[PDB]
């Protein structure tokens, strides 16, 4: 996260770290959506242009974390993966359209003060809150600058951007399964996701029921925190029927 701040303890208890077993390293962010299911970006698991194609046994998920590098004894919980599910129409060839994946855990994780699931949006919450200017929150342990790494989880609040501005900021083809967020050059304030934040959540706190909803997944950007560029996020609600189909069939 560029131009964010240290998270408070328990501020993002759904935040998950996707951790490579060997070499031991941060791979991506992710989020906890129930006691057995973790949501992430498909490109965190499958990106053939970079020879990336992880299998279940390559990875662990670490839940309840605050420190990036410490083993947080008696606080974090480490889970093995039973199965990865990648959206069947994830477009890794072109533009990361439908950049979404689920991971089913081998055993349920115990909830605690530090471990708690986020809600997924219904159609009405998405319609109300996914509006230009409305702010969400992005969290992660990724790099602090494009070109370094945080001691603890970082957090930044960023406004959703009008779709024509998103489209006009890039040569990539934008789809309805993406939205973009970030400040404009004339707005002064700054902030963005960066390398290592991929797959983590963009959340909003509903003013109707005071619950946090995951509206986006950190998907892609061109650089980090560049003037006139925006971060792109998977539109979770647009892909929720797929999420529900997987959980109903395999949960």
């Amino acid at each position: 996260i560029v131009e964010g701040s240290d998270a408070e303890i328990g501020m993002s208890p759904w935040q998950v770290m996707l951790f490579r077993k060997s070499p031991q390293e941060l791979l991506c962010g992710a989020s906890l959506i129930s006691d057995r299911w973790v949501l992430t970006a498909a490109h965190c698991l499958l990106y053939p242009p970079w020879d990336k194609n992880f299998t279940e046994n390559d990875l662990l998920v670490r839940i309840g974390k605050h420190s990036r590098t410490r083993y947080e004894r008696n606080i974090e919980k480490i889970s093995m993966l039973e199965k990865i599910y990648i959206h069947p129409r994830y477009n890794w060839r072109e533009n990361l359209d439908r950049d979404i994946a689920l991971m089913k855990l081998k055993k349920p994780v115990a909830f605690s003060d530090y471990i708690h699931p986020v809600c997924l949006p219904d159609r009405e919450t998405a319609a109300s809150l996914l509006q230009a200017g409305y702010k969400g929150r992005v969290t992660g342990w990724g790099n602090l600058k494009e070109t370094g790494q945080p001691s603890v989880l970082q957090v930044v609040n960023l406004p959703i951007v009008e779709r024509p501005v998103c489209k006009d900021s890039t040569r990539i083809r934008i789809t309805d399964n993406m939205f973009c967020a970030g400040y404009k050059p004339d707005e002064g304030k700054r902030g963005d996701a960066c390398e290592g934040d991929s797959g983590g959540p963009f959340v909003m706190k509903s003013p109707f029921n005071n619950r946090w909803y995951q509206m986006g997944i950190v998907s892609w950007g061109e650089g980090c925190d560049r003037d006139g560029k925006y971060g792109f996020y998977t539109h979770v609600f647009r892909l929720k029927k797929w999420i529900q189909k997987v959980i109903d069939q395999f949960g």
Partner: peptide, 11 residues
Amino acid sequence: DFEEIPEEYLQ
């Protein structure tokens, strides 16, 4: 860079 995690999670 990362602190070693317990061996039980790597078995």
